[PDB]
Amino acid sequence: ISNYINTIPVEEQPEYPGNLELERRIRSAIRWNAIMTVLRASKKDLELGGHMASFQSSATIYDVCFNHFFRARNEQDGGDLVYFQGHISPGVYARAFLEGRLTQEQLDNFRQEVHGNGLSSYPHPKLMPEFWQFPTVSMGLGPIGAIYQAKFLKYLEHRGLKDTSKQTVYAFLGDGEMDEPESKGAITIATREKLDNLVFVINCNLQRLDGPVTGNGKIINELEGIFEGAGWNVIKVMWGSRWDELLRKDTSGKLIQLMNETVDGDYQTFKSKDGAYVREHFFGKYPETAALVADWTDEQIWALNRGGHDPKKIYAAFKKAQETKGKATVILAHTIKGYGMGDAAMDGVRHIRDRFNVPVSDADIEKLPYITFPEGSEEHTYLHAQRQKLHGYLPSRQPNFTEKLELPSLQDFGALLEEQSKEISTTIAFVRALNVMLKNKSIKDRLVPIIADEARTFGMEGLFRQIGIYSPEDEKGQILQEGINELGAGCSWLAAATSYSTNNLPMIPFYIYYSMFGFQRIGDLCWAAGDQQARGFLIGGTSGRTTLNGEGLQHEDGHSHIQSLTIPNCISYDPAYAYEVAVIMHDGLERMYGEKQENVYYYITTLNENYHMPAMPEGAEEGIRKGIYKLETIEGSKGKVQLLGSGSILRHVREAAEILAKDYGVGSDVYSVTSFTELARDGQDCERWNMLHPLETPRVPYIAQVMNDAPAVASTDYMKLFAEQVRTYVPADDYRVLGTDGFGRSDSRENLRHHFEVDASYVVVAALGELAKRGEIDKKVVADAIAKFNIDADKVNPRLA
Amino acid sequence: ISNYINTIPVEEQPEYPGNLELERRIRSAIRWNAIMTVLRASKKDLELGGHMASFQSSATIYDVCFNHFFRARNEQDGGDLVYFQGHISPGVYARAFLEGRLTQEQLDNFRQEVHGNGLSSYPHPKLMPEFWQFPTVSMGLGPIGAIYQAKFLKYLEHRGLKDTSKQTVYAFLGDGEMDEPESKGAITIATREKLDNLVFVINCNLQRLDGPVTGNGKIINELEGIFEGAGWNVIKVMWGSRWDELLRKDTSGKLIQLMNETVDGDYQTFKSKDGAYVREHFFGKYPETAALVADWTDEQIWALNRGGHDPKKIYAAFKKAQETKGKATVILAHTIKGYGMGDAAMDGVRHIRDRFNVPVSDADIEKLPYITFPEGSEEHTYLHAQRQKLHGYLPSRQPNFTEKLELPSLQDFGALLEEQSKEISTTIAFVRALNVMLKNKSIKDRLVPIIADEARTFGMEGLFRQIGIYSPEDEKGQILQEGINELGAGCSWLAAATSYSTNNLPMIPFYIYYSMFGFQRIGDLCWAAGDQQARGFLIGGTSGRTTLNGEGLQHEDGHSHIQSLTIPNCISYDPAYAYEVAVIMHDGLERMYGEKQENVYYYITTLNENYHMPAMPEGAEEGIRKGIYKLETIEGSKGKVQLLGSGSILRHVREAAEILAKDYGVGSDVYSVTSFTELARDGQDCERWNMLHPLETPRVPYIAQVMNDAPAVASTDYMKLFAEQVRTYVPADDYRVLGTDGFGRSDSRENLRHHFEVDASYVVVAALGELAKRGEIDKKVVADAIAKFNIDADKVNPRLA
């Protein structure tokens, strides 16, 4: 940790290239418009919300960037990728409006979007697909997402995919936000990969929402110490030019000491006082210091500003960051929260109007008007001149990539559609589908297989020889290995899955990991990924509660599908067979990267268990994509039932169907449910349409179109709700659901399949139980089956076990 | 960072206190038994799994701690809290067996626990409630969990609740694991809080699972750099004692420069070779280094070992960490993964038996026999003698606290059961409930309110002046303010929620935060919390998709309940009224901290919306607990329906009921569903039991004992699956569910509840639609309602919007 003064001495500070006075004129109008936007929304009294004090402390930092650094998307690259602090959006909206990119009506619709012409509270690409790019309001996700974005940009270059060398990734963070584990949790990665195309701009106003980050300490010193220890280039922007001659004057080194020894809380207090308090309490600590401002009007004292408010001091830091190579730079900008708001952080409105010399007369001020710069005006000229010199305006977003990809047809996945000689798993099927894609000229180099240490478990190690491991194992390596870091890998996946828009270069990621450590461990990023319109594939390997049998409690995933079904634009599947994964993967590619360019991403759970893989029934394609199709019908004169299964459990309900037919003469319809969730979504859609169109003929849910009314039983490797979610749509009077509710534990697949009551014997007993209720069979026969199958009717509910 | 040598010089290292010779024998026996355990499970060929290489690399570190450092739970405190690395469990089981705490049958039942006498793969309290304490296999959770456990212990001491001053928290981590953002993302807090009762012990064998952590780097240096930069005391245990002379006679400084410049990849290459190789490639790099070992035989060179394998080196670091105050300490133990296993890294195991001079014949080697030390043997005496000196054996866990608390009665919350004066929200109701508790003499100081920055949003800023904010606002402050760090807040919550077991001091944490950042953001921690038998309350504030109306996409929670229902021992509630919040909180208090000592934790979503809070209907208590109760029935001569609601949407369902009655003559039964999830679970339990007891009297779902068969409609601020989850158990033929499926956006509550098709208007059209279908009313009546209510029957499905 260095002294509590700027990192760059004024002697090494470059000349500021802009018109300081004209820029302040433009900056003040933006400040005013930002405040009017939030104030106008406030007037509605609809509890709309919005922030003001934050952008007030960082406006000048953004201002210098928009005028002298931020490159907009251009013919060569997507420009600088700016991860704007989410809640300073009113300021971004204020500038866009001034640039004529947003209308007055839109600003008046701030935080009112449902009707079509409003603005989102925060950066939400899904809501404003041509404006916002990176979802940052969920603190912590911005810094790590940016780190991996910077890394992915380097990847594109090294692979020779695109020259991203002129792109800088900027993460604008708050100091309170750095407390999130994800904020500093991955910073050593920027050093490892020498990400000199990444700049962290932490706005150090010393306060978070309900108070100061560390009132008893020095947050800027803590930040410096850890980022410096992490090998980052640290630039502290502490004081404005006014301090320059003061420090130069101080030969006793007492100012540095006072500055160094004063704690956050104190500094924050001074800020709420007056020149008198400072000179007395601050400067009054030592005579040597008091004697510096001794000849200072208290108003001269109170005039000393924090470095984050001085453009000249801000410019030096960004110019230096821009020049630095070999590592990432973090700029710690010292600011005042609620800067120039005084009263805050109509009398207060008159205050900021005066404070920033805003061009609004006393006759207009009560109208809370927005300010605009006419064409031909000095301000209008400069505002656009600076941006044009920087390639245009940002934030901006292109929702669809321009190129046409020549995707592999399903036929190209032929070998997977046929019966397998060897017993394999859906994971081996996945790796094989990847290889089919690796032979496709058009997308072969666009594929981005991602791993988090474990490859062997997923039999991914065979790909290493064919495509290599990105290791700037060389800079041309194609597979991204992120180590034991599920969040970081999800971030690389997000960078690749949204590359089609950000860089207009579609990249198709395939991130495979232990399914349990998916939505459960990185769920907030998965939700933000949907916001970011990510188009890619998340592969939850070693899935199913009873299939990853030895690992136990914190590994056995019998619910990721319950977690995944909560994301609107995530398409989840739990295939049982290899031909299904091929059909599913092919459909995803087509939907997402085909001409449709559907803003959706895929989640496919795959297995680590091998078994016979039959050939795809002819014409089963549409059903597989839809989520269900009848596998076969079995004859039986004693009765009829329908049996549904998915994943590794389908194999077991299929065995229950043979037992039922053989030992009980009960026939059945066997269905492979590739997606209980897509089927649930379809039923809901039909029911909603029906409810909304009372005079129209009721639409029939696909699952209801596929199934009949015979008593049904379903079993899967997930908790019962996974299959229960389609109850409303099952056309049978009876629909029993077996599932793996309860905490996992270590044992053999067989022992677990019995414990969780999802094996063949339970399916048979469940099927028999319904026919018994119908009067088709004697209750005694089901009671004997329970006995016959060594089933403990009185063992604790697995959910409780 | 510092030189690549041991932090502690020999002249400063203390005399080893134990019998190294005897200790090696015992250690070798534990090494053997651990491998026999995993190998024996392997023989079963049931894909049970288990690891061996990892524990082989860290065995001596644990051995020195078990012999001279670890304090077992005792009469005064819970002893040292050790977060044992997850996959080295075979080594912990091997020692427990040698200590006579585990039987050979149990070891023989390693990873086969479904039947009663087996052992879990990893540390899982829920599965082995009296053995394991902290769930660590999900990497990253243990380090951050440990930091907040150390902080909580301090908290207990500052608040005067318990002198935890003699307890040390050890987090045994892997170097690969440190890549998880959660691993280093919060190390800065240990310095902030001066956690000199926290010791991070990172096993630096330089490799993850599928390779080195950073082959082209030095993770020990990286680790050292960031931890020291974060203010921690870092102690490096690099080289064994054989290096001392070499380093001491090397006056040129070349050996250090060589050690310093060598990257991890080459170091690892050295251990796969032999002495000759090292002599040429490592020492042969320079004439001065080559000369240090010129007099050595390739064997004497091959014998040079890593510090983490030398008891004397290990001991010095743990001892030194023991006298370090004012901050936490990180011990970087340098080891060899797959140590002593050589080749591997039946009879091929005879190599390790040779390697560690294991006392088992080459004829019995194939039998994979366990080693034990007979009562009276020098080894047996020393093993137990060392432990007794340290208060016994660990790990061990106590499932229930011993003291009896005098919990508040429901009557004590009487004011909350009456009709409320002003319009308040369920969050105000929650804070008021907390205050009732804070007046209880028995539990007032056992309460642990936890907030992540935001307090005023939840009106918690009012408890500050009352109970204070913990600051070691003083050190006796009760409220834990964890800033913008949801994971850290949940870790403090976890430490508190399980203090009843680890310290036999029941503490009752109430963590309130923006619901969206609960399970979605810290779900892996939440799952581990259930594994750790956590007893506390998680309060999801500003919950509901349409209720936190202005915030939008990344804040509007309409699915946290779908995530929370995936955890078996978490009880979820979505109350609409203040009296319900009181009954649920009282019930949870009694269930968890009452005589019942039920291992479950609660999840209550609360609102930021104010509306009329009615008086609790006499006798509604049990129904509120169970999940549903009839609020009232409204008369209607034209038809009848059932209307269900929860949270903030219930009042709109009641509004729909009046509309139906007043505008259409349709009567209804209105139900308040406090917990759709608990009703589903109950129904699932009923049908499961029914299926398993076919000859017996069928069990009726509680919801079927409340509802009747009139067409039903339900609406909640959550996606449709939240209410649809009870379909199977709803006794009505028609059951329409309205929900907030889809991404959130900014707008007014009114506009949002209409966009998400969940307001009174949609409930009325849904109910009327059901009657028209029954021929009960004209289809034109529903069509006109849709018109009357300005409903867009053809707008896009909110899920797709």
Ligand SMILES: Cc1ncc(Cn2c(C)c(CCOP(=O)(O)OP(=O)(O)O)sc2=O)c(N)n1
């Ligand atoms: C994960 C998460 N937690 C909490 C919040 C709530 N929140 C919080 C806690 C804010 C305080 C921001 O403090 P900061 O120091 O990061 O930045 P500023 O002081 O510059 O605003 S702004 C905001 O929306 C959030 N958006 N995301």
Ligand SMILES: Cc1ncc(Cn2c(C)c(CCOP(=O)(O)OP(=O)(O)O)sc2=O)c(N)n1
């Ligand atoms: C969150 C998470 N991700 C992945 C794994 C899988 N995993 C991984 C990736 C291991 C490698 C351990 O590497 P390490 O360096 O932390 O430890 P050792 O070298 O001492 O074994 S052990 C293991 O079970 C896990 N348990 N938890």
Ligand SMILES: [Mg+2]
């Ligand atoms: Mg701040």
Ligand SMILES: [Mg+2]
């Ligand atoms: Mg390792």
